[PDB]
Amino acid sequence: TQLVAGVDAVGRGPLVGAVVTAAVILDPARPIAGLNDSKKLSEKRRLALYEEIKEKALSWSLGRAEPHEIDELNILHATMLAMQRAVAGLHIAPEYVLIDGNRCPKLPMPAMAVVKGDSRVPEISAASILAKVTRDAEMAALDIVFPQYGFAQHKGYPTAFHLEKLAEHGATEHHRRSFGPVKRALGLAS
Template structure:
């Protein structure tokens, strides 16, 4: 297996990841992180594999120790206008462009790279293999989860704090009872069909 840690040694590397491509509600959130080799952070991993408490602690440590970091997003409206893939690419570009210093190389989680001027590569399961991508996944997830908990206070009938907008049985049942709210993605099913039914 390729040793990504060694591959990027001595390079000003930005790791990029997204959170929220699959949910029925809320923005897609991305982050870009350039770690400081002189200030290592132990325990970096795929954010989905970490407990909420551990993610929170690591998020604070990343913000304190990383050389540079930036969190960005694409809105629900942009998702519905461009589709989720293109909106994710837009959000990733915003994350890298928001860094105070341009990276020399960009490693992006997954298999799709935004169309940009940066040199880099995609890394399948990069959030488990490349520490900078792991850090980006943690920042993005902590940010998005926190926002969905705030939306839970605005729209308590949907239970956003429990499922973070994903299409769980609880969430779909709430949609059936109450219909979509302002943060639901109009282009995603079953929201799209529900809106079509009400417009007839």
Template structure:
């Protein structure tokens, strides 16, 4: 069915999420439908780009894409559902929020959210499919920017630097300062601090 769909021009959304590994902050997903008439040079897996390049590409994607959307699942949802289900929920929200609904959604990874269109999960899709690359860039820039803001709200944790990931600095800050309301209480290093 997917192969038949790909035989004609159709609206294809790339979908990716960022933030499954961090101990703090939301998981953020983006969906992007690229415009074939407005190519964007240099789309790649967001993790392989410099911060400056990601930021520039993010602005270009928002300007040139036929449709784009950035959505999230909150810390409370991650703790309630688990990170996989919360990631799928954020992806579903991002596709549903697009101004044009796609006929096919290309999802990064090996799990698909529940959607009303055809879907294909692509492992390492962010380095294979330009629309998924674009989604990964939007999601990463949005989440990183939010964690920089959280650094001001919760000084001492180093959120601007590690973006909530479990670095040595972050784990030591949790031990010294305790946990904040943006920490994921279902994650082991945070749970350990809660049980002290």
């Protein structure tokens, strides 16, 4: 109950890029504040928090899937194996794991899921902040490499802007080819 670790997954469904997950472990032997959630604050609010929790947590974790692997088992299998990988990556084992939702993987430690943990669990909130900042960094890198799509603007989500860009230019190797629009761009739709 003292080494409770909570993991969260952000960017589960953006058309482009792989998913990213984290798992930060923190106990009450240091000061934490301003980490209620991540989907209601500003980007700035998320830039200090990323670093704040990075140095306040004893351990920090990461994990990501691949476009082929994701499309090979959808966003219900890959997403789970990604957080399994993230838990595997933790330097120190956690006697308690938390996963936003009502579904749990096959893990050797007693993991369990809680719904809407992003606004009640500071752990899951911090993990979501870390994983979201890493997503934003990856999308910035891709938009630098691919400036013709505007990844850094909409974060590769299913917006009308993204739909029109994928209809005009097409899909690259990074796009998840198992979704609809992307299949409609190259003609794989039945």
